Amino acid sequence: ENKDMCPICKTDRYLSPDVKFLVNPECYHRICESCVDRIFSLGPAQCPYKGCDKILRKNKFKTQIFDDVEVEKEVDIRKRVFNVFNKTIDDFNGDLVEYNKYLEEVEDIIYKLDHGIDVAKTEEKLRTYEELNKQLIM
Amino acid sequence: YPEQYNYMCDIKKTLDVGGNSILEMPSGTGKTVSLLSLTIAYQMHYPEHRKIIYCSRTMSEIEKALVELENLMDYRTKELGYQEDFRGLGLTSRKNLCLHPEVSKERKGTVVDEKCRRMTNGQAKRKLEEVELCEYHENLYNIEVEDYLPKGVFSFEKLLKYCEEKTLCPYFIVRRMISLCNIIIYSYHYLLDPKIAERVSNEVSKDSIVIFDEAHNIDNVCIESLSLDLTTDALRRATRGANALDERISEVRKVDSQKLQDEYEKLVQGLXXXXXXXXXXXXXXXXXXXXXXXXXXXXXXXXXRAEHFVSFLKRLIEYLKTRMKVLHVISETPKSFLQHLKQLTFIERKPLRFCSERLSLLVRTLEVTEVEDFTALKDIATFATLISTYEEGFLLIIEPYEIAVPNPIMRFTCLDASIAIKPVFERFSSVIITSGTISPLDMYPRMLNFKTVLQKSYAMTLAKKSFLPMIITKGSDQVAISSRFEIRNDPSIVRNYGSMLVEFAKITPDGMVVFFPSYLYMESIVSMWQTMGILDEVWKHKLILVETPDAQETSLALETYRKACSNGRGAILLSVARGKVSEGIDFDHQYGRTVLMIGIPFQYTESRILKARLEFMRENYRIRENDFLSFDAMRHAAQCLGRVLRGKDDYGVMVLADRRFSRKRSQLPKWIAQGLSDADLNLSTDMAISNTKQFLRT
Ligand code: SF4
Ligand SMILES: [Zn+2]
Ligand SMILES: [Zn+2]
C-alpha cells in the first residue's frame, strides 16, 4: 500500500520514492532499502514490522509485483514442491488416470502446506520430500 | 414481373444444383422473390423436406419477413381454398418475447434471461425437494401448444397477444418449436453465437436451406464475435468475484460439503459429458463454440476440486493484472503470451476445459448467484478459453497509454472469418446468399474463400424514374477536399459547405435525409452555423441522430419524421452511415425523396485493430491499402443508396459528393457528373418530370 511499506518509512511518496521495498520470504513484510540494509548489515535480526519477531536473514531477497501473500506463498511452495516431485511416474507411459491422481496428490500436499493444518501432516510431507530427493539421487 | 422472374429461375436452378450462390438483387424489389421461391421449391419436391432458414441483420427485416410470410399464407390460402400445415416461427429478442418483466420488473435490459432462469430454477426446485413457478407453466410442452402453430400462424406480435390471452409463455413455445422445424426468422448474431449457435444447431438438426439476407456485413458479424476490451474495471470485478468465490468456498466447506463431493465424483467418473448430459433446464455458461472447438475428454483440473480452481484462478487474474500494468505500446502473440504465462506459473493449455467444467460445477452449487461477479468470471473464463485454444490469426493486443490514467486496456483480436462460417458448408447445402448492397460481388469469392456461383442483377428499366446524378463542383471545389480528412481542416470551409447544404435544402424542401461519414462534422456545424433559415422556413424542425444513439430517441425521431412528412412539413435527418439503424423501410413519400451524402464514407484509421486486420488480410489475399478504403466505404454508401430505391412506381434522387466515387461501382451504374448549382435546377425539373411520366407510362 501507499501508506505502509516500512514501519519507519511508511510515507515516502513526497520524499521522492527512489528506494525499493524488499520482502523477506521468512517474514512477508515490506522494508525499504535504507532500513533493511542496516538490518542485515548490523546482524541477522528480526524486523520491527508491527512487532515482528521472525528473524530477517542476510540477502536472499526478491522483487514483488504484488499478487497477495497467499498466492505468492502458494506459487513459491507450488514451484518448490513441483521441483521436488519432478516428473516421477508422469509421462513414463502415457496414462491419464494415474497421472491425474498423482497430480491431485501433489496439489493436495501443496494445499496442506499452504494451509498448515496442525503442523503434523506437513512434517510427513517434508519426510516425503526427503524420500523423493533420495529417489532422485539414486 | 419478368425481371424478378429471372431471379426466380436463378434461385430455382441454384437450389436444385449448386450448394451456394451469390445472387445480387435490386434494392427494394427483391425481398418477396426468395420468400415464395423457397416455398414453391419445397412444394415441388415434397411438402416437408427443407425449411426456410432466413437470416437478417436487424429486427425490422425480421418483422417485414414475418408480415410478408403472412402475405404468402394468405396468398396460398385465397387462391386454392385448401388449408395446409402452416409454418412461420418468429424468433425475436428475449426481452420482447417475454411477458413477466413487463408486469413487475418494468425493465428492458439484457438480464431478463437471468430472471427467466430464476423462474425455471423455481420450477425445477418445486419439482424436486420442495419463488413461484412463474406466471403459467407445466403446460407449455404439451401437444396442444405444439399444434397451436401449424394450425394457425402465431409469430411475434400474434404470439405475444396469443400468449397474453391463452395465459402462456412464448419463450418455451418458441424454444420447443425450434425442433418443430418451422420457418425461423432470426439474425446473424444467433447463427454464429458462442452461446446460442450450439443449442440452435442442436434443435434445428440441420438439413435445411439457409438464406443470407443482406449478406454484406458478414465480416463485421464474424469480427464482432470476439474482441472484448479489458478496461481495468473488469479486474476489480474479477477480484470481488474471486472474493465471492472464496466466501462460497467457506459456505460449502462450512456445513454442506456432501453435494460438492458427489458432483465432484460425477466429474471424476463422467466428466463434462456426464455433467452436461444429466442437467436439464439449467443455466449454461459461455463456450468458444463446441462444434467448432471439437475438444472432448475434459478433465476437471487434473481431477481436482474447487479450491484449486479458485486458487489457480486468483493466480490467473493476478497474472492478467500484471500483464495489463505495463509501459504503453506492446503487442502480444497468443502463443508467446501462453508461454510467458507458463514461465510465470504452470497451468498448461487446458484452462478451457477447466472453465467450461468448473463454471457448471459452481452453478450446480450456487442458489443465490451475484450477477456482476459471475459475469466477470464468465469474461475471464472466455479469455482463458481463447488463450488456450484458437491461435491461428488470433492476436492479443494491449491498448497504448494515452492520457496515464484512462488506459489499462487489453483487447483480443479474432481469427480468420472463414473458420467461423465454415460449419454451414458441411451442415447444409444450397445456401442462398442474397444482398442488394453488393457491388462488385468479387470481394466475397476473394475474401472468405468458398466455391460458389456469381449472379449479378439483370434488371434496369425506366431510367427516367431513377434520377442518379452526382455533384463534383460545389461552386469552388474546396469543400470536397476538406471533407475527406479524418480531422476537419479550416472551419470556415466547413461553414461554407454547411451554407451549401442550406442552399440545397432550401431549393428542394421535400423530405431530406443527410448521411455523414462521422459525427465530428455534425457536432462542428451544429455548434455555431451562422444560419438557421431552413429550420425557420421549410423544415420547421431538424432531426439529428445523437452521437450516442438511444432507442427511444431514434424511435421518436423516426415517428417524428413520418408525422412531419405526413403534415406537409418535412425535416432534415442528420444521420451517420456508420451509426446505428441502417433503416430499410421505404415505399412511400414519407421517406426522403432527396438524399444528401457528405462526401464518401470513411473508416477511422490510426487504430491497432485496423493495422492488425490490415496486415492479416495483407498476408491472406494481398489486398493491402486498396480494399479497406473502397469496399467498406462502398458498403456504407450502398446502405444509403438502398434507401433511395423503393420500387419503380416511386422516384428519388441521391447526391454523392467527391470525385473518388467514380473509382467505385454503384447500383444501377447510370450517373452523370456535374456541379451542384446546376443540380439544383436539374432536380427542379426532375421534381416535375417524375410527376409527369407516371400517368404517361401507365
Ligand atoms: S417462464 Fe416465460 S414469463 Fe416466466 S420468466 Fe421465463 S420467459 Fe419470463
Ligand atoms: Zn524505512
Ligand atoms: Zn518480519
Side-chain angles (χ1 to χ4, degrees), chain B residues 192-245:
Chain B
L192 301 180
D193 202 337
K195 59 180 298 298
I196 304 299
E198 301 81 35
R199 183 178 59 90
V200 175
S201 180
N202 296 332
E203 297 181 82
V204 180
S205 300
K206 285 79 62 179
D207 301 332
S208 297
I209 303 301
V210 186
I211 309 301
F212 287 156
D213 178 33
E214 300 297 83
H216 59 281
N217 303 129
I218 303 300
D219 59 330
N220 297 330
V221 178
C222 295
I223 284 180
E224 292 181 22
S225 304
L226 299 174
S227 70
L228 177 65
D229 303 341
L230 299 181
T231 64
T232 205
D233 302 334
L235 300 179
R236 304 286 82 89
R237 301 173 65 261
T239 302
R240 298 180 298 181
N243 300 331
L245 289 187

Side-chain angles (χ1 to χ4, degrees), chain A residues 6 8-9 32 34-35:
Chain A
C6 180
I8 308 179
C9 304
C32 76
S34 61
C35 292

Side-chain angles (χ1 to χ4, degrees), chain A residues 24 26-29 31 46-49 52-56:
Chain A
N24 188 267
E26 302 300 88
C27 269
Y28 303 98
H29 296 152
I31 306 287
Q46 70 285 353
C47 57
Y49 190 90
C52 171
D53 300 329
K54 296 172 294 181
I55 304 300
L56 185 142

Side-chain angles (χ1 to χ4, degrees), chain A residues 65-67, chain B residues 302-303 312 314-315 318-319 322:
Chain A
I65 44 92
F66 300 96
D67 291 342
Chain B
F312 303 153
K314 285 180 300 180
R315 177 74 280 269
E318 284 299 334
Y319 174 81
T322 305

